[PDB]
């Protein structure tokens, strides 16, 4: 399928144990997609002071359309030193590995895979 319904655990930035997916734009997008498929991907909602507490490159989910079955359609955009790889809509948050942190919420998304 070109899209997959996922419910992403929303993590507080200060709980996050593994603060990014790797060391290159291509690796973080690769690892993000693998973790999304494996159900091992969390979401941190972006506010003042969040991103400097996480590791670059960043992987964002961004709204790709204006929401089947409650699931917002999203796609991945990476960012490294102020350059984004991909073009999409509003940021829903930054993806991180999930290693058992307790979430505050779930974000239902339809991921363009």
From Swiss-Prot:
Residues 2-113 form the CoV Nsp1 globular domain. Residues 1-113 are annotated as: Disordered. It is found in: Host cytoplasm. Inhibits host translation by associating with the open head conformation of the 40S subunit. The C-terminus binds to and obstructs ribosomal mRNA entry tunnel. Thereby inhibits antiviral response triggered by innate immunity or interferons. The nsp1-40S ribosome complex further induces an endonucleolytic cleavage near the 5'UTR of host mRNAs, targeting them for degradation. This inhibits the integrated stress response (ISR) in the infected cell by preventing EIF2S1/eIF2-alpha phosphorylation upstream of stress granule formation and depletes host G3BP1. This is Host translation inhibitor nsp1. It comes from Severe acute respiratory syndrome coronavirus 2 (2019-nCoV).
């Amino acid at each position: 399928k070109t899209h997959v319904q996922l419910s992403l655990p929303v993590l507080q930035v200060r709980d996050v144990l593994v603060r990014g997916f790797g060391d290159s734009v291509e690796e973080v997008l690769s690892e993000a997609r693998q973790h999304l498929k494996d159900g091992t991907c969390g979401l941190v909602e972006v506010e003042k002071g969040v991103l400097p507490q996480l590791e670059q490159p960043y992987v964002f989910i961004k709204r790709s359309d204006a929401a089947p079955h409650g699931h917002v359609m999203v796609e991945l955009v990476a960012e490294l030193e102020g350059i984004q790889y991909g073009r999409s809509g509003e940021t829903l948050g930054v993806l991180v590995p999930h290693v058992g942190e307790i979430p505050v919420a779930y974000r239902k998304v339809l991921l363009r895979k």
